[PDB]
Every structure is written in C-alpha cells, then in structure tokens.
Amino acid sequence: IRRAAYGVVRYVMESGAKGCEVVVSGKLRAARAKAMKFADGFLIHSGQPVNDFIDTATRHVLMRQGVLGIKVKIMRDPAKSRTGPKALPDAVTIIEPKEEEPILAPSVKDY
Amino acid sequence: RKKKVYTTPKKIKHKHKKVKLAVLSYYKVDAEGKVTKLRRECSNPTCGAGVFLANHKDRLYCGKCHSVYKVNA
RNA sequence: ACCUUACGAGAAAUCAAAGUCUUUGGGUUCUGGGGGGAGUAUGGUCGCAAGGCUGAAACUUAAAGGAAUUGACGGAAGGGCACCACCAGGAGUGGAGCCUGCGGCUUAAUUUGACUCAACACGGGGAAACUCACCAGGUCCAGACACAAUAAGGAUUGACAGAUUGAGAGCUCUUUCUUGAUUUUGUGGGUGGUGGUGCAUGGCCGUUCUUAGUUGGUGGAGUGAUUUGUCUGCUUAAUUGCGAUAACGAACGAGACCUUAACCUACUAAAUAGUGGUGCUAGCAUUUGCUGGUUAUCCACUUCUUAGAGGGACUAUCGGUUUCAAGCCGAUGGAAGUUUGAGGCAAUAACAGGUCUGUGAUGCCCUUAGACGUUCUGGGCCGCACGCGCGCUACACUGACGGAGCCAGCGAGUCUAACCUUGGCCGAGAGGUCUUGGUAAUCUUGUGAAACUCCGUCGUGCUGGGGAUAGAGCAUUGUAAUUAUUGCUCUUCAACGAGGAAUUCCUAGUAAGCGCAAGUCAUCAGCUUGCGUUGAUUACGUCCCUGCCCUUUGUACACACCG
Ligand SMILES: [Mg+2]
Ligand SMILES: [Mg+2]
Ligand SMILES: [Mg+2]
Ligand SMILES: [Mg+2]
Ligand SMILES: [Mg+2]
Ligand SMILES: [Mg+2]
Ligand SMILES: [Mg+2]
Ligand SMILES: [Mg+2]
Ligand SMILES: [Mg+2]
Ligand SMILES: [Mg+2]
Ligand SMILES: [Mg+2]
Ligand SMILES: [Mg+2]
Ligand SMILES: [Mg+2]
Ligand SMILES: [Mg+2]
Ligand SMILES: [Mg+2]
Ligand SMILES: [Mg+2]
Ligand SMILES: [Mg+2]
Ligand SMILES: [Mg+2]
Ligand SMILES: [Mg+2]
Ligand SMILES: [Mg+2]
Ligand SMILES: [Zn+2]
C-alpha cells in the first residue's frame, strides 16, 4: 500500500506537478480505522485559484475488510498552463531594468 | 424488534399442482367404425377442432379460451 | 555575603567551588551500593518513663528515583477578543389562542434517527392511498446456476360457474378442460432486505473555528528532548503590519482571488428593449397647442433597458495626532471612502459528533418462501390527562371596516405532453365553460403584491378589537376526503386589557413592519430559500457577565481532574 502511494506521488512530481497529495483512509490491520497522508511539494487550499489549478479525485476501493477511500490532489504548475492565468493571483514580478552609463556630453546625430 | 409469535390462524393450504391424471384423449372408441367425439369442441375463429369442452353440471367450457359455449337443447 | 563570566565542572538545575577528576594519587575521618519488608523483629546497652543508640533476615518486586522538556489541567496570577458576550438601545420570546417538532401517556400500530452550544418547522420529514420502514390480513417468486429426482402412455401452467374471500386473488376447494419440457421436488449455491452495528468503515456534512492559527530552509542556544524565529509595546477585521530584536528570508491559512450589487449621456449594437418624429386617427381647445390610440407608416436614435469589452477607488487631497512609523480621526472632492457592500472558497491537528433510512458505497451478523423480499386491501404515523422548543394571529383609534388612488423585484411555465393562463360568457362567491398566446426579453405579466395614501362610518365599550371552537349548505383536487384535504357563504363570536423568574437576535438601506416568487406540490403553507417595498432609535466603547485564545506559574497528571 505504501509502495503504491509513495510510487504514485513520486510519479506525479516527476511529471512536472507543483504539488501532489494522496490520502488513504480505512481499516489497516485493526478495527479502528486510520488515515494516511502522503504529500510532496506545496498546495494552496482556498480561493478561486484552487478551482483552476488543483485537480482532485476520490475513489472507493472494495477490500475484504471494508471500503478504502483514496483521495488524490494534484497541483499543476501555473507556468505550463497555456490556457488562462499563468500565475497565482498575488505573484508580482518586477522586471530588472538594464543599466546604462550617463552620457555627460550633448550631441546630435544627423541624417 | 420485540418478538415474533406468528399469531395468525394456521391456513397453510399450498395447492395441488394439477395431479397427474390417467390415460387421456378419450374421443370415443369404435369397434370397426369411425369414432365420433365426446365433449363437443368449438366454432371459433382460431381453434381448429382440436380443443375439447369440459362437461360441467349445466355448462360447457373450452379450456384454452375459458369461455362457456353451452346452448339450449 | 553579592554581581558578572565560564577557564573549568556537571545528568541537568546550577557551582569561584560542586574547578585544578580516564592527561584518573596533597593529608585524613565518616557514610552509601535497586525499591519494599524496615529503622521493623531480635539480642545488647543507656533512660524513672517516653524513648535513644546499635540493627537483620525470610519473602517480595522491574522498576522506585533525579533534573529538565512539550502538553493537559488548577477553587493561581496577568493580558486579549466577540451583539452566537456585555454597554446605550430596538424588536421580541417566556403569558394567551391556534400551527408545528420532541418527550411522556395511550395504542394493534401510534415506524424510526437526532438530546447543551454542535437534538426539538431537523432528516429538505407540508405522511388520505403510494412514499412506508409500523400494525391486521390476503397473493406472488421476481429461489440465478449446477447436480440428482420426476417425467412425452405428460415434468408443469392457466381458468368458466358456485362455496369461499374485503374482493370480478380459482387464493383454496367442487368440477373437468387446456398447456407442453420453459417448469416441479431436494442437495448445494445464490439473490433481495428503509433488518442490526456510524463503536467495523468510505464519502459527505457539522463542530473546535471562520476564530487566527500553523510550518520548513539557513543561522544562533542546548549533550539531548527541544527552543528562538513565532516578541515587551503600538496597530489591525486579521502572527494585519510597524517596531524592538540572534535572527534573516519565505510557505500555508488571513489577504489577494472569483461571483454579485452599485458608476459610465465613453465604445460595440438591438420592433423579443425603448424613446422622439413622420404618416393614419380619436377627444379637447383653438394660435402656432394638450393627451392618447395605431402594427408593416416608414426614417433616424441609444438617454433610460440588456451584456460584451473596458475604464474607475488607491482611503486620492488637505489638516490634526502618534517609535512622527504602521495607522487613526475630521474636512473637500467623488457614483462609491464601515475590508466600497454582500457572499463563494477556506490551514495544521482533531471529535469514537451525525449519517449503514440518499446511494447498484460498504465489512461482518441476521433473514430468505406460513420471508425481515415484492405486491394488494384496511388502519397508523394526526391518537391526549401533561412538560418543553421554533412560529402565526392578536390584545386596538400610531386602529377596524367601506369606497377611491395606486407603485416592485427575484423568478417559473406544455407535444407527443396538457403546464403558465389572457380575453368573452354564466355564477354573490369559490368555481364552470368557449376560444387564444406562450418551449418564452415575444404570452401569462406593468405578475396593477401588501403595507401605504385620500375621503368616509366607528368613538374607549372585551367594542364594528380578536376570530378560536361549533352547525348547516355550495364547489375543487383525487380511485377514494369520514379523525371535517383545501377553497366559498351564513351563523355561533372563546381566551387575550402588553405578559413573572428567565431569555434571544441585532450596528444601516441595517433592525422592524409588509407582501410576492420558488422548493416540496394531483390537492394542501401558519415552513424554508430568495426578492423587492416602507424604513427607526442607539453605539462607534469595554472586559462587568458568558464563552474562546494567549502569557507567567505549580504539578506526584499524560487513556491527560470524568486524572
Ligand atoms: Mg474520516
Ligand atoms: Mg520531577
Ligand atoms: Mg406563547
Ligand atoms: Mg421530522
Ligand atoms: Mg419527524
Ligand atoms: Mg413490510
Ligand atoms: Mg431483501
Ligand atoms: Mg420492505
Ligand atoms: Mg464511523
Ligand atoms: Mg537549527
Ligand atoms: Mg547544536
Ligand atoms: Mg531552525
Ligand atoms: Mg483630529
Ligand atoms: Mg373584525
Ligand atoms: Mg408576483
Ligand atoms: Mg360555538
Ligand atoms: Mg440577563
Ligand atoms: Mg417580517
Ligand atoms: Mg506548590
Ligand atoms: Mg506520568
Ligand atoms: Zn378455443
């Protein structure tokens, strides 16, 4: 179970995702159930950005002890979008000005 | 739940599955003659004189058409 | 004696000795060798005594203990928030009558879940049948498949009439036709279950908490668990930020984002939106005007209506006050200056919170043909001595009744069906009937809503306030309305004269008043989700009460004080 869950989170981050997150909830070896979380990268949680960049999915695996729910959250990288917003809402980038020397001598070029 | 006493009067009368009868198709039998037919058939639009008629007390059935065909003598 | 370093020491707290101790030797005396049993027995010895001093063992036990750390708690000390807390208030509820939900009682059954916030107009739970799970009865198999048995000189199915049955269930029987290998009887093995367990689970939802909280990298402190960063103060809705500063720089949550409402005589456009004209007319005036009607009069227009793209607010400008910083408070301008208003989304860690009765989501347990399956008929969920919780109508002239005026916004609506219904006619009404428009910016529909406004009757009287509880009829939905479905008429016309202790919600188009649409819906709203209409008073604070968070502190707690 961990092999798969570490395997799938490794695969998604190698595929160029910004963050991946898988949850397995269910009875493992005992009557008292327990949730495992397996994460890598970072993910946002709130706002309109989650709708556009997080893809989420839920499954019910039917074992012989009971149902095992499987959640997967994948944060795609905003830079590789090509359709819509290319960055998070509060990303600001100031472009570096190319620095040049002061002239100190007035001249006219002619034609 | 509380209990199941199965209170009701016992009426277990699961039916007879139409008890296998003895040798059938008794049309008539004729010593060195052609046989007429007991249990009159029916002048229907489908039944081709193959279905007989039950002989009840004062009525004649059909069986396959479940409709009385009795007429006055 | 104290303060500071840490050469050094130490398990650390801490220590100028507790240092000069694995690089181990200045001199000397005393005591200890896991926790109990036990400072107990026994024997001495001192003492008037009380007792003192010496002082075991059998046996028993896997820890007892020390110093720190992080939590949890404290009938410990401080700080900070919030109309699910208070302040100043507003409107109430608690009293009454009814409506509805829960407990109780009763019952054949009154099916069940959920009991502080975080159960109780909640399960979209407004149940006549169905739903439906409960009760009294009656059918059916819709018991796959396999193997045996039975058996084409019939394995099995169906029924006319009568008895029966609530019954036109031949269900069962009397009676005898019809069918043809599909079935039937067992053995397995399945299937179905609104049967059980939410304390065996998934998913979803609620709650902590929508408070402001959480975490790495690198550096610093510590042997370490850990700590600082993440803080004395000020500030903010906010660990929001300024400042201090062994910390710098970021991440998640907050914020940004998205939706919506407000501005645009700026752009692009429009009989499914709307003006103005010009035709054609009507009425009144008469001058050179006023108000309408008209769909083939047509020409132009976009202000208002609609939605595409954009613009616009960033607390702008000025003044004041504050390490003169983040900010805060006035004034001006502005459509807009409480986060511009309102939401949607919403961290880490949790909870034995709710849901197996939403699910063909589910493990196991039970049941499976006189069934806990499915269906049909009739009841029940509504039964009423009582106790609670959301509500509706009121207790009256700041009003009731009559006539007249008269204005919204959100929205829904039928075809292979019969939904929204205009108009004409009949009827007091509720309703009936004949046509029509609409699959919709086109028609219902300007949804002519109610409060309200103007004139009138009432005249402080449980009164023309209130309309509960009863009796007769007329209609509508529906297979069916009796424990009245709902609507209408007439009559009967109760409590209640502002409500004890208690207690809820709320800071501007907000509270409160007033209606309408939608959801459920064949019929039924006193419910909910929204929308407009009319529109206040009070405050712009604080920790007093109640909650929650943080700091300091103590701890023998850590399934954590229900220890
Ligand atoms: Mg869970
Ligand atoms: Mg200690
Ligand atoms: Mg009351
Ligand atoms: Mg209910
Ligand atoms: Mg209920
Ligand atoms: Mg049943
Ligand atoms: Mg079943
Ligand atoms: Mg059932
Ligand atoms: Mg559970
Ligand atoms: Mg470090
Ligand atoms: Mg270190
Ligand atoms: Mg660090
Ligand atoms: Mg000032
Ligand atoms: Mg009256
Ligand atoms: Mg309307
Ligand atoms: Mg009466
Ligand atoms: Mg009080
Ligand atoms: Mg109201
Ligand atoms: Mg103490
Ligand atoms: Mg302990
Ligand atoms: Zn025939």
Residue A68: DSSP 8-state: E
Structure tokens given for A34: 């327990």
The gap between B63 CA and C438 C1' (Å) is 58
The total number of residues written for chain A in this structure: 111
Amino acid of residue A94? I
Q: Which of residues 33-52 of B touch strand C (CB under 7 A)?
A: 39, 50-52
Closest CA to A14 of A54, A41, A36: A41
Q: Which of residues 76-105 of A touch strand C (CB under 7 A)?
A: 88-90
**Tokens 């959640």 correspond to what residue?**
A71
The Cα-based distances of B50 to A36, B29, B43 in angstroms read 77, 17, 11
Closest CA to A89 of A40, A41, A52: A52
Q: Which nucleotides of C are covered by protein (CB under 7 A)?
A: 136-139, 153-161, 171-179, 184, 195, 200-204, 251-258, 344-349, 352, 361-364, 370, 372
Q: Which of residues 2-21 of A touch strand C (CB under 7 A)?
A: none
Count other Cβ atoms within 10 Å, centred on residue B55. Answer: 13
Nucleotide nearest B18, from its CA to each C1': C156
Strands (E), chain A: 17-26, 34-41, 54-62, 67-76
Residue A96: DSSP 8-state: P
**Tokens 């963050």 correspond to what residue?**
A19
Contact B55, B66 (CB under 8 A): no
A73/A55 Cα distance (integer angstroms): 6
Q: Where are the alpha helices (DSSP H) in chain A?
A: 2-14, 49-53
Q: Is A21 exposed, middle or buried (0-12, 13-18, 19+ CB in 10 A)?
A: buried
Residue A16: DSSP 8-state: T
A97/A77 Cα distance (integer angstroms): 27
Closest CA to A61 of A31, A98, A95, A24: A24
